[PDB]
Amino acid sequence: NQASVVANQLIPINTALTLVMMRSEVVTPVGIPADDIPRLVSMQVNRAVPLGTTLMPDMVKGYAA
Q1: Which residue of 31, 37, 42, 53 has the lowest C-beta tally within 10 Å?
Q2: Which residues are marked as site: Important for ice-binding?
Q3: Do 6 and 30 contact (CB within 8 A), yes or no?
Q4: Which helix (H) or strand (E) holds 40?
Q5: Helix, strand or coil, per DSSP, at residue 53
Q6: Are 24 and 5 in contact (CB under 8 A)?
Q7: What is the bridge-based pairing of β-strands 22-25 and 4-7?
Q8: Which value, to the nearest 10 degrees, does the dihedral of the CA atoms of residues 43, 41, 15, 13 take?
Q9: How far, in Å, are 2, 11, 24, 25 from residue 15 at the CA level?
Q10: Residue 8: which of 54, 42, 63 has the closest Cα?
């Protein structure tokens, strides 16, 4: 049902998110909702996020729904 943000490339640690890094997919478990992609632009991740990984709230510095 619900789509989440998934890494479209490896996202390195302490690197600001851009649109080319984030795709939407229906995955389980559910992560950050796909609708939040625009909000995530320029926010940094606190760990490296491998290709195909679902972005979870705890991975993004400053993220609160």
Answers
A1: 42
A2: 9, 14, 18, 44
A3: no
A4: helix 37-40
A5: coil
A6: yes
A7: antiparallel
A8: 70
A9: 27, 7, 20, 22
A10: 54
